[PDB]
Amino acid sequence: KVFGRCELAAAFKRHGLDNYRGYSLGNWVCAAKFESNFNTQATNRNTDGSTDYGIFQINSRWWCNDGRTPGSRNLCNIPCSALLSSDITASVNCAKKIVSDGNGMNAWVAWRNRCKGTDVQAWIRGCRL
């Protein structure tokens, strides 16, 4: 499923992401935009053989099991395919664990390079929330 900007903001809010660990809603919408273009089905393989899944591009080396990443830790205890569902619940529960890991949202390279320090409030502007 390809989410609309405000539709995703609303889903994120209902799922308790607004200000989770101090990160406002605009931060999460901005990260989803640049990581997957709001597409739950997005996947991308890395040079190390691992693969990134879903809206938040969660990595198979540490967070989920895809059956083809030697030494995956599967910290979110879920098959990576679950992260591609139109129901964002799994993606959200796993992202919450990732952001609590100690590096905050820096864990997401696109967030660090394209959202961090920018006017992220623009991402939820105009939305009924």
Resolution in A: 1.8
Integer angstrom CA distances of residue 19 from 15, 24, 52, 74, 79: 11, 4, 24, 26, 27
Nearest to 54 by CA among 30, 22, 90, 23: 90
User: 108 near 102, Cβ under 8 Å?
Assistant: no
Active site residues: 35, 52
Report the distance separating Cα 70 and Cα 48, nearest Å: 10
Say how many Å lie between the first and final Cα of the chain, rounded. 21
Q: How far apart are CA 76 and CA 64, in angstroms?
A: 6
Task: State the residue range of the domain holding 16.
Answer: 1-129
State the structure-solving technique: X-ray
Work out the angle at residue 2's Cα, subtended by the Cα atoms of residues 72 and 23, and round it to the nearest 5 degrees: 65
Structural domain total, the chain: 1
Is residue 101 marked as binding? yes
Contacts of 123 (CB under 8 A, 6+ apart): 5, 9, 25, 26, 29, 30, 33
Instruction: Please answer whether residues 129 and 13 qualify as being in contact, where contact means their C-beta atoms are separated by less than 8 angstroms.
Output: yes
User: CATH number of the domain that 124 lies in?
Assistant: 1.10.530.10
Residue 11 and residue 65: Cα distance in Å, rounded? 25
